[PDB]
Design a protein around this ligand. Structure first.
Ligand code: SF4
Ligand code: F3S
Ligand SMILES: [Cl-]
Ligand SMILES: [Cl-]
Ligand SMILES: [Cl-]
Ligand SMILES: [Mg+2]
Lengths: 264, 597
């Protein structure tokens, strides 16, 4: 008996779903076929419309208090909630309905965790993170835009193995993935420590992989596994490929000034 | 009832609602009316989301814009970043160095392949493939089919197919069907034999594992996928062969290896599957879904062999009207009389809603209001009123004409260009003629079916044709970036290692007022970003996105967009099972987050 996952989509870009299917260890194929029962997910599900809607009630009844609700994106509070319409009704109604009998709630990515891009000023839809709407359930935040593939599947793997939510920090993030700042283990840290910085794109310093702090790197204030776990089966991460961290796993990163403005 | 663009709209028949439309990106509602014989006589496309990126961008730094608009969509990840840096570079008269151009082209073509292949297998295939029928397939006959469909594909043994089938069997036998739950399996709308279903489902699983490899090209040059990093003035992935740097020769060799794998996948798995499935559905007579493709198609044109020289576009663009493939009109994204967006039937407001606005003059003020003939309430819609405002998608038109955009449009345009002497369109022409011969003659002969004599003019404007064009485009993009890689390495070894032009990085060097446009042939069609800069800040930023074109609601004149036109004149086997609706809508690869932004 595989644990049912009901994966809802609010206001989002679907980058979190895309990241999830990049996982190499475990393969998303193996997650879907052998680990969970992915019973609702707009991106991949066969059923549409009325047939899709009927799945929710069926799983919620049969697996009451024993399914995981995964939320990608977030609910808008402006436009009477109808800036995100599902089945002719506000997404917020679907969210609240499915949340009520969930064993656990995963807020995938910065959208569900904090608001992400749509919640940046002036937030025309009043997009609101899941934990501000669902206030009576345990929620795990898995921030990042999107989070690393293996972080997402790593959360699922822990939850299925132990039937527990992993240990969380004060912001609700799993300590197993978000205890380190990018800057802690960044391979460019020796350059930072030696005062060796890029000043302009493609200068001699950039060609020698010098630290990107003066180009706006937010690694010193951003908690994620990018410098160690890295991206796409450890191929690279933003800093290795030459762009500073933009702080994409941190609450409100879009409104902390230009990405190219250095920390003070 | 009224007639428009040769379609006889009639809303007096039985009303059918599909909400949510699944196996798309984002949120869509579709309503249709069917006649006494279950033929669609009316179709209504409703974009059911909005976030307001255009509003959010106001007052921000143009150099940061790419990252904001990249998050319009994580499926077509990076194409908005490309449009944005191009728009800013255009506004500020920045010419990027050759390596930055080639790296962007490689990234763009990587996205094309990944997006197209994942779309076909993981979003589209279940409209053509009955997974329950695959469970009844004979592994030996499946093996034999595989060798006829694609001789070169090495994963063909009877035992391999038996193993896959057995895993699917155990999965289904558990009673936890997951993504196959409540499917439309067994519908007469499914026509493939069991062996073709098993072959396709096997490739679905193969593609799921392989797609993660292709995007490692993005990871090398852009740090991560989804959402790789871009840069105004070039690319951040500085080059050093003898150094520590983001790009050295080993990293470039890695990219080449991924490109070569891509070429094999397209040639051995993806193109042959679409040709085979296309042939079988053609044999069943399912040539519905042409919509506007039979008349009006548009693309801005893309992939110039020589940077900044549009005459060398390898997917040459323009506009075709009235199904006249002998006259391609040039399209100018700067001309205020060409690309315009109406909101007459959209949840926005203009000063004057009888006119369309060019995106440099675009306006995005939300206006969620329902017509008086709506069934239900503002927060509980039963039947949307398409006589009023019914979508978060604006209505783009070209000189007032409703156009289809996408791979199919680009392939029709390529064919037209090649007929008129354009040698840059030679490869797409070759692909199309090859495909027609395979679909009409070679595959039927191989499978013991009668041969047909469809011309490209007859075959391409259809849901099959639209699906075919996407596969062919993936193949062509893989071939092109293989050449781009060679050009990149050659340029570097010649002594040019530059990756960024920083002459105008500092806002103090900018004109105090400026405007720019960046266009991209994104996976789903014609993408444009139009920017106005004032005193170093974003004054206006307007996006017109491919699904905005295709999924648009009706304009001031009541003309229908590509989605609505494509559903017209289509029989449904069972009006309560949206199999045909999904099959045709999915052939456009709808991205609703893109459409609305
Ligand atoms: S590149 Fe960024 S994370 Fe790495 S050492 Fe420099 S400031 Fe720290
Ligand atoms: S931008 Fe995001 S992906 Fe990692 S390196 Fe910074 S947290
Ligand atoms: Cl955020
Ligand atoms: Cl760099
Ligand atoms: Cl470019
Ligand atoms: Mg727009």
């Amino acid at each position: 008996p595989r644990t049912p996952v009901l994966w809802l989509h609010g206001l989002e870009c679907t980058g979190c779903s895309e990241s999830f299917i990049r996982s190499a260890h475990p393969l998303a194929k193996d997650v879907v076929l052998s680990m969970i029962s992915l019973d609702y997910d707009d991106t991949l599900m066969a059923a549409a419309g009325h047939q899709a809607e009927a799945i929710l009630e069926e799983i919620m009844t049969k697996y009451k208090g024993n399914y995981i609700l995964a939320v990608e994106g977030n609910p808008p509070l402006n436009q009477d909630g109808m800036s995100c319409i599902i089945g002719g009704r506000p997404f917020i109604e679907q969210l609240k309905y499915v949340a009520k009998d969930a064993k656990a709630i995963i807020s995938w990515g910065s959208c569900a965790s904090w608001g992400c891009v749509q919640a940046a000023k002036p937030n025309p839809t009043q997009a609101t993170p899941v934990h501000k709407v669902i206030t009576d359930k345990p929620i795990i935040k898995v921030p990042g835009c999107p989070p690393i593939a293996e972080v997402m599947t790593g959360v699922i793997t822990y939850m299925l193995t132990f039937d527990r939510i992993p240990e969380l920090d004060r912001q609700g993030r799993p300590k197993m993935f978000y205890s380190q700042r990018i800057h802690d283990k960044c391979y460019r840290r020796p350059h930072f420590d030696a005062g060796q910085f890029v000043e302009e794109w493609d200068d001699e310093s950039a060609r020698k992989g010098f630290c990107l702090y003066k180009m706006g790197c937010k690694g010193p204030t951003t908690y994620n596994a990018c410098s160690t776990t890295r991206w796409n089966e450890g191929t690279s991460f933003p800093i290795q490929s030459g762009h500073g961290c933009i702080g994409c796993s941190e609450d409100g990163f879009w409104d902390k000034g230009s990405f190219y403005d250095r920390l003070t | 009832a009224y007639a428009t663009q040769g379609f006889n709209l009639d809303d007096r028949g039985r009303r059918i609602v599909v909400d949510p439309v699944t196996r798309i990106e984002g949120h869509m509602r579709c309503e249709v009316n069917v006649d006494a014989n279950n033929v669609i006589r009316n179709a209504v496309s409703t974009g059911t989301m909005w976030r307001g990126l255009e509003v959010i961008l106001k007052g921000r730094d143009p150099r940061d814009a790419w990252a904001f608009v990249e998050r319009i969509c994580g499926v077509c990840t990076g194409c908005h970043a490309l449009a944005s840096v191009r728009a800013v570079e255009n506004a500020l008269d920045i010419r990027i160095p050759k390596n930055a151009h080639l790296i962007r082209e490689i990234m763009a073509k990587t996205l094309q392949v990944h997006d197209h292949a994942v779309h076909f297998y993981h979003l589209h295939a279940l409209d053509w493939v009955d997974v329950m029928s695959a469970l009844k397939a004979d592994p030996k006959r499946t093996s034999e089919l595989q060798q006829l469909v694609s001789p070169a594909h090495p994963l063909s043994s009877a035992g391999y197919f038996r193993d896959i089938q057995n895993r699917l069997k155990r999965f289904v036998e558990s009673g936890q069907l997951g993504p196959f739950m409540n499917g439309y399996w067994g519908s007469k709308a499914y026509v493939l034999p069991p062996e073709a279903n098993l072959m396709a489902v096997t490739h679905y699983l193969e593609a799921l594992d392989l797609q993660k490899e292709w995007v490692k090209i993005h990871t090398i040059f852009g740090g991560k996928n989804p959402h790789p990093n871009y840069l105004v003035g070039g690319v951040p992935c500085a080059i050093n062969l003898d150094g520590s740097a983001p790009v050295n020769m080993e990293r470039l060799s890695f990219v080449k290896a991924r490109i070569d794998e891509i070429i094999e996948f397209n040639k051995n798995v993806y193109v042959p599957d679409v040709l085979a499935i296309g042939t079988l559905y053609k044999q069943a007579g399912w040539l519905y879904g042409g919509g506007l493709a039979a008349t009006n198609v548009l693309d801005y044109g893309e992939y110039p062999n020589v940077a900044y020289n549009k005459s060398t576009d390898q997917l040459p663009g323009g506009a075709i009207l009235n199904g006249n493939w002998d006259e391609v009109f040039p399209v100018d994204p700067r001309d205020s009389q060409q690309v315009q967006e109406f909101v007459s039937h959209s949840w926005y407001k203009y000063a004057d809603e009888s006119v369309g606005l060019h995106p440099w003059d675009g306006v995005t003020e939300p206006n969620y209001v329902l017509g008086a003939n709506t069934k239900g309430t503002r927060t509980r819609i039963e039947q949307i009123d398409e006589s009023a405002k019914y979508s978060w998608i604006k209505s783009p038109r070209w000189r007032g004409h409703a156009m289809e955009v996408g791979p199919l449009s680009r392939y029709i345009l390529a064919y037209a260009h090649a007929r008129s002497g354009n040698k840059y369109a030679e490869r797409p022409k070759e692909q199309l003629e090859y495909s027609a011969q395979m679909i009409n003659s070679a595959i039927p002969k191989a499978l013991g079916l009668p041969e047909t004599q469809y011309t490209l003019k007859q075959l391409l404007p259809s849901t099959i044709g639209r699906t075919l064009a996407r596969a062919l485009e993936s193949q062509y993009c893989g071939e092109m970036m293989h050449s781009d890689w060679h050009d990149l390495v050659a340029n570097i070894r010649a002594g040019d290692t530059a990756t960024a032009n920083v002459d105008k990085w500092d806002p103090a060097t900018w004109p105090l007022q400026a405007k720019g446009v960046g266009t991209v042939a994104a996976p789903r069609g014609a993408l444009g970003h139009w920017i106005r800069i004032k005193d170093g800040r974003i004054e206006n930023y307007q996006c017109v996105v491919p699904t905005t074109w295709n999924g648009s609601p009706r304009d001031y004149k009541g003309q229908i967009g590509a989605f609505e036109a494509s559903l017209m004149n289509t029989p449904m086997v069972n009006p309560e099972q949206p199999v045909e609706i999904l099959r045709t809508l999915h052939s456009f690869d709808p991205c609703l987050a893109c459409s609305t932004h």
